[PDB]
Amino acid sequence: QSMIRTTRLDYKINMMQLQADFKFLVVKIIDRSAFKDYNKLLASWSPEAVTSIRGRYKKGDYLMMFRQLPAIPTIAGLELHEILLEDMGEFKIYPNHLLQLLLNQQSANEKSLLEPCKTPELLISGEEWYREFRDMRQQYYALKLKVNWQQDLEMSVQTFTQVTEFQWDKQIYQFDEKRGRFQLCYQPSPGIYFVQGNHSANRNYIDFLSLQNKSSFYKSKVGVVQLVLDNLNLNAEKYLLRPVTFHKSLVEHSSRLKLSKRETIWQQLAGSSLNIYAQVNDRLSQELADQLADHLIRSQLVRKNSVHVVRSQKIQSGFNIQVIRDVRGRAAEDGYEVAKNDQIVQHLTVENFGHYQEGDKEITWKPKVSGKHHDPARDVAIVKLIQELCIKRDLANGKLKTVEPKLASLTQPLEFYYFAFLKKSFDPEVMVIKLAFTPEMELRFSKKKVRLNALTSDDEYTQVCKRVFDSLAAPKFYSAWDSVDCVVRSGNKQLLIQRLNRTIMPDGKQIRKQLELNRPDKTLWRDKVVEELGELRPMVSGDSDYVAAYEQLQALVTGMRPSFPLKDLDEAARKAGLNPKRRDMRQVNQFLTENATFTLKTTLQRELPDSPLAGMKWIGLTRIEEGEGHFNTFYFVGSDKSLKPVVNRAVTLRRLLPLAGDAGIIDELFPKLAAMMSVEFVRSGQYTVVPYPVKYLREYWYSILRQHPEYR
DNA sequence: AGATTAGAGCCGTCACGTATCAAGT
DNA sequence: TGACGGCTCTAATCT
DNA sequence: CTTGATACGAC
Ligand SMILES: [Mg+2]
């Protein structure tokens, strides 16, 4: 059974050893203005580490670790307290604080020992994470690593920009070239100073996972995290009862459902007219409208589906795609047109769709045509235009037709609740929208306003709000309710879907192992390689050309130079015909990875019984053991296609908790939601994270906001 | 009064191929 | 107003 | 003997 690994950390600190070799102490800046002393005081000190605890009931602010305690002075506005490790519980401290305090001493360099650290946050950076930013203004983006109270390891990106003087008030950070991390600066020191906050229009991003090679892997979030964890394990082995490793977990109700081809939605729009018109006459949308109309005509996909694409002058019945100028707050006339009666309108803007940079007077937009026939109808953007058009038709007609009888009959007995926390109207207020399906698959939208102060009402809309209200940690801000996605109701059974910051983390240990096996340079010796292949020859069994390819590989290394890089051998195999795409090479390729000192290609992309890239694909359900007895259920959404060599983002964990119906809730509804979450018309070419009726609800609420500005 | 968490706003993301099971004269 | 989620931010919050 | 329309793969 597969095993996903979340962010949660599993570890045990060697408590006595931590007490034996270090003397911790806590500092509570009593008065606001006091910080300033604490700083000068901290500058004259040399603590092993510093961390912030932010105890609920005060109980100190900064916990700091030394080897030998300096003579503690007494100053007003703050107070210091030498602590014993058993009182660690007393002051509202938790083992995550000790783990963070120990982690602050590590660095990203391989085989890095412990070092003193005055900065209460691990901020890992590199020389390759720096842009010039026009004229002499340095800028570095770093990966802050922090262990929170829930034992989650949050990784964030923080941008630092150069300043030309030692500035008080705001914190001052300096880059340590050798260690690679950013250190807080307490006194004016030689070097260059940085402050938090980007001052450019380039949002720095770090790829979540890189699989191209080891060098690119170590430049990703997973690579840096794995390096830090390995350094911590090899440096704190005396201080750790159990090594710091990511949580294991089992996966249940896995759904390897295959998304249908995106051209299926094109078939749905069959036999109807699709008008295209522009906002008055701006010479920009007018021209873009003509180009869009002509391309669809020659696509030959609409001709198969008998789609009438007509370039009209103004509003027409049926499907109508229009072109506007994205005026909004541009201090001009807004050409956006509101659909009325049976008209269905989907709007597109020249700036976004045509990538119209302020410049050339003619639109250079061109659909991405590929796959033998160069038909623009396969363009991702144009496909999504039809995808929304079908949804808006369903909303107008009030009938479900997109998901085929099958899925529709599966979603018939379930009802969905969507919560929209109102911005204005002082008193806290959320909009509860309930969607119901008739046996004839007709949409029934109903909403009831509820006040967050008085939930004593017995009506259904109030009761569901009361159930969610207790579940949420701080139901006072927007983001508390924005985290809530929907509430699936099966009559007397309810289930809540909530977002979380917990994410899937692939096995960093295995990724490092295979990538090191496939290191591009990986200097070898001819004798050892020949012997290595020789001993494993009896274990290759035989699959016809499989052994012949293996024997061909053995002969290839025989005639080569005694010391060669792996790239030269890899290049030689390409001439030999052992392309890493045919059945013969792949079996040789996979066999080498399991037991050898080199491999032509890793097995990371390909699926395996126990693949290290687990949880990044398909839909699965897991039961993370958070609190003793209180099992928590989560579901993750990956990607149906094979993952690209580089993965930019990660997979978050949505949370399912039974609002009513004990534990039988999750086992029954999840297979229903599994088929709900396998539709490609919400997220193009990808699994929808939430059930698709949530999409339907969002558009209906958006339509309400158009004529109800007070709800915005 | 610095820490933070909020709350909003943005970049990224959605292809050719060898394998093949059955579509046959 | 391709639009969808992560998530990086900045400002707002709560000190 | 022959090819046509789905899959794990790269990359
Ligand atoms: Mg829209």
Side-chain angles (χ1 to χ4, degrees), chain A residues 1-58 60-712:
Chain A
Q1 150 178 57
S2 228
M3 294 276 297
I4 51 110
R5 345 172 57 102
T6 93
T7 51
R8 156 149 299 203
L9 300 178
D10 286 341
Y11 58 98
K12 287 300 298 316
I13 308 99
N14 199 292
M15 192 46 108
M16 304 346 299
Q17 280 333 286
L18 216 54
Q19 189 42 85
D21 318 329
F22 300 112
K23 322 302 159 204
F24 324 87
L25 69 98
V26 78
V27 177
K28 8 182 340 104
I29 12 87
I30 312 162
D31 132 76
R32 203 55 70 251
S33 63
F35 309 167
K36 315 301 298 314
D37 149 83
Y38 172 72
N39 317 330
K40 178 55 55 165
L41 184 275
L42 184 47
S44 45
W45 281 6
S46 299
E48 275 286 348
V50 187
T51 187
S52 97
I53 57 185
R54 293 301 151 71
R56 177 66 27 80
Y57 272 47
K58 293 179 179 179
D61 213 21
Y62 285 7
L63 175 46
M64 71 181 336
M65 192 200 327
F66 287 74
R67 306 193 160 284
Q68 203 69 355
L69 317 82
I72 304 96
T74 83
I75 318 100
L78 79 169
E79 76 207 87
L80 305 93
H81 270 45
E82 175 184 9
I83 211 68
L84 298 178
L85 243 194
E86 303 86 288
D87 320 313
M88 181 295 308
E90 200 289 310
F91 269 80
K92 319 290 245 156
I93 315 171
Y94 304 113
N96 81 296
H97 296 136
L98 300 185
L99 177 61
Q100 176 65 49
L101 191 71
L102 184 34
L103 198 74
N104 290 352
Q105 299 161 81
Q106 321 275 332
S107 77
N109 288 347
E110 272 280 4
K111 307 321 180 62
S112 60
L113 66 147
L114 291 171
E115 67 191 309
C117 213
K118 306 190 184 187
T119 298
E121 39 200 10
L122 178 53
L123 303 144
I124 294 139
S125 159
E127 82 85 11
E128 80 303 328
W129 280 348
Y130 145 79
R131 67 165 33 82
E132 160 63 42
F133 183 33
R134 274 70 134 195
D135 44 358
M136 320 65 67
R137 283 251 298 183
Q138 317 212 252
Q139 213 220 35
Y140 289 72
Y141 44 96
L143 187 82
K144 154 156 194 284
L145 293 201
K146 155 161 289 292
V147 186
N148 54 15
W149 56 284
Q150 299 188 297
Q151 320 275 87
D152 321 328
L153 173 84
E154 60 176 9
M155 45 218 49
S156 61
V157 188
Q158 295 213 329
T159 320
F160 301 88
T161 318
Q162 184 275 357
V163 280
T164 62
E165 68 286 289
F166 195 73
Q167 181 45 280
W168 303 104
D169 322 297
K170 306 132 81 192
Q171 326 306 323
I172 282 292
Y173 293 80
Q174 279 185 140
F175 177 54
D176 195 332
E177 317 154 87
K178 292 158 299 320
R179 310 312 285 111
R181 330 172 316 102
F182 268 117
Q183 301 195 15
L184 207 38
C185 201
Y186 302 97
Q187 63 182 353
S189 65
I192 188 74
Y193 313 133
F194 292 88
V195 309
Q196 291 192 77
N198 154 67
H199 297 318
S200 100
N202 317 311
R203 314 272 300 294
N204 306 280
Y205 294 126
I206 298 192
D207 285 315
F208 176 67
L209 174 69
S210 184
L211 256 47
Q212 296 172 297
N213 53 69
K214 177 265 303 180
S215 176
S216 301
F217 170 57
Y218 281 159
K219 283 329 114 168
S220 100
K221 288 187 176 190
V222 175
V224 171
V225 163
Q226 189 49 58
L227 279 180
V228 168
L229 290 186
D230 281 354
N231 282 345
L232 173 62
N233 290 320
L234 201 39
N235 287 334
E237 75 292 351
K238 322 175 58 83
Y239 305 135
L240 294 213
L241 289 172
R242 309 210 278 101
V244 176
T245 179
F246 279 124
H247 215 341
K248 272 336 274 299
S249 159
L250 82 168
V251 50
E252 329 187 17
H253 275 184
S254 149
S255 91
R256 257 165 288 283
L257 271 283
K258 187 160 309 309
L259 284 179
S260 58
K261 189 58 73 53
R262 82 168 76 140
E263 332 295 338
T264 311
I265 203 51
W266 249 122
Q267 156 263 298
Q268 177 98 22
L269 183 39
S272 308
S273 302
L274 200 157
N275 283 267
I276 292 98
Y277 47 69
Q279 52 157 230
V280 209
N281 54 346
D282 79 330
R283 160 71 209 290
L284 316 173
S285 55
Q286 260 294 98
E287 203 44 86
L288 185 44
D290 314 327
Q291 290 216 310
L292 182 56
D294 308 328
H295 283 19
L296 302 174
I297 291 162
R298 45 184 47 72
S299 157
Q300 277 280 18
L301 283 205
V302 300
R303 302 174 193 195
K304 294 183 41 61
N305 302 281
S306 313
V307 189
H308 291 288
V309 195
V310 180
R311 170 57 184 69
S312 152
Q313 204 43 266
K314 57 99 184 183
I315 296 297
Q316 297 301 316
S317 174
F319 289 92
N320 319 288
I321 297 180
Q322 93 153 107
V323 282
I324 37 159
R325 297 303 328 305
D326 196 65
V327 185
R328 333 188 95 136
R330 278 298 315 287
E333 278 181 348
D334 199 38
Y336 191 93
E337 210 283 331
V338 53
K340 101 164 55 53
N341 198 265
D342 58 336
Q343 271 60 21
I344 313 102
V345 182
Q346 176 53 46
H347 311 80
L348 67 88
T349 55
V350 182
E351 296 80 8
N352 202 349
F353 207 160
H355 322 129
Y356 168 56
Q357 170 47 34
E358 176 47 272
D360 46 356
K361 300 328 166 282
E362 326 90 340
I363 320 105
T364 50
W365 163 80
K366 263 205 60 63
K368 312 310 302 303
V369 279
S370 297
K372 173 189 72 39
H373 264 264
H374 278 313
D375 39 49
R378 274 179 37 71
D379 179 272
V380 182
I382 308 185
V383 157
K384 181 122 174 232
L385 274 202
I386 277 76
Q387 282 187 4
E388 288 267 291
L389 264 191
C390 161
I391 276 157
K392 298 186 126 136
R393 158 165 80 71
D394 269 3
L395 275 207
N397 294 343
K399 194 186 300 318
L400 195 57
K401 285 192 56 49
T402 317
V403 305
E404 273 299 279
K406 183 41 238 122
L407 212 48
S409 58
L410 203 33
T411 73
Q412 205 280 337
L414 301 191
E415 271 141 351
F416 293 77
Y417 291 84
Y418 176 81
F419 298 90
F421 182 88
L422 286 84
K423 294 314 191 268
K424 296 95 162 182
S425 83
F426 22 87
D427 290 346
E429 225 175 78
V430 311
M431 271 315 327
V432 174
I433 315 181
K434 165 205 194 183
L435 177 54
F437 300 90
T438 74
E440 291 75 29
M441 330 317 298
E442 303 180 342
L443 299 181
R444 302 299 175 165
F445 284 102
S446 43
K447 62 164 193 137
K448 157 151 182 173
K449 188 185 275 214
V450 74
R451 296 179 41 223
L452 219 32
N453 305 336
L455 312 96
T456 64
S457 176
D458 197 69
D459 73 271
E460 302 87 317
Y461 295 68
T462 304
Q463 304 205 341
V464 50
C465 194
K466 179 251 283 182
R467 257 88 173 281
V468 182
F469 183 80
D470 313 323
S471 66
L472 284 176
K476 272 193 320 158
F477 314 119
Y478 176 18
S479 308
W481 292 93
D482 223 3
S483 96
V484 192
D485 280 3
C486 89
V487 175
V488 187
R489 162 178 198 282
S490 187
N492 272 213
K493 308 204 248 163
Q494 293 178 1
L495 178 45
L496 169 135
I497 306 184
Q498 187 196 10
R499 199 183 168 301
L500 251 176
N501 302 11
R502 203 170 290 228
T503 86
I504 297 314
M505 195 83 49
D507 183 303
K509 180 107 176 50
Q510 294 286 358
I511 300 280
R512 187 182 41 97
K513 205 165 289 174
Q514 322 223 335
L515 282 184
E516 280 250 20
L517 261 285
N518 199 10
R519 224 167 81 212
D521 52 71
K522 172 61 61 63
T523 74
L524 311 172
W525 282 118
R526 206 182 37 207
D527 45 352
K528 331 285 198 310
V529 174
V530 168
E531 310 317 296
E532 171 152 68
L533 297 191
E535 321 313 298
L536 278 308
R537 157 74 45 102
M539 190 23 45
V540 314
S541 74
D543 311 303
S544 179
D545 176 40
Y546 171 45
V547 293
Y550 189 89
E551 298 156 334
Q552 180 172 347
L553 168 64
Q554 218 164 33
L556 182 65
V557 315
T558 314
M560 282 215 36
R561 152 173 307 104
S563 71
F564 53 91
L566 182 62
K567 47 173 49 58
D568 301 46
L569 161 71
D570 181 20
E571 211 175 290
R574 201 140 280 112
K575 334 166 187 150
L578 300 180
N579 225 8
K581 207 143 38 196
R582 327 162 65 158
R583 283 274 65 102
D584 44 26
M585 182 56 267
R586 289 186 166 159
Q587 309 250 329
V588 181
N589 198 230
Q590 149 185 348
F591 169 84
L592 273 188
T593 286
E594 332 283 5
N595 40 286
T597 74
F598 75 102
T599 174
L600 274 287
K601 201 52 173 69
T602 73
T603 60
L604 272 46
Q605 288 159 260
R606 64 197 322 233
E607 207 137 28
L608 267 203
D610 182 328
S611 44
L613 293 174
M616 308 288 270
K617 305 156 80 75
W618 327 119
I619 288 96
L621 169 140
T622 173
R623 294 230 162 76
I624 279 293
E625 173 38 54
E626 315 253 37
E628 208 277 341
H630 330 75
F631 274 83
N632 290 10
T633 310
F634 310 95
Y635 77 85
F636 57 93
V637 170
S639 178
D640 64 353
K641 322 186 198 162
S642 281
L643 327 162
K644 342 286 295 172
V646 70
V647 195
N648 280 216
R649 307 172 194 293
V651 171
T652 54
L653 271 80
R654 301 293 187 280
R655 183 162 83 89
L656 313 153
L657 85 86
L659 281 175
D662 65 82
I665 294 312
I666 324 288
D667 277 328
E668 214 219 332
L669 318 171
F670 187 91
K672 310 302 195 22
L673 314 172
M676 301 215 168
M677 296 197 332
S678 313
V679 278
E680 78 304 333
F681 75 94
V682 182
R683 205 155 111 243
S684 324
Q686 279 143 81
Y687 289 134
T688 310
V689 160
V690 311
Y692 77 90
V694 184
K695 126 79 41 146
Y696 274 50
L697 283 165
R698 155 157 59 256
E699 326 266 346
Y700 171 60
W701 179 236
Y702 279 1
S703 151
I704 291 287
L705 287 171
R706 184 101 201 171
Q707 49 81 43
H708 273 345
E710 82 281 349
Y711 292 166
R712 287 184 181 184

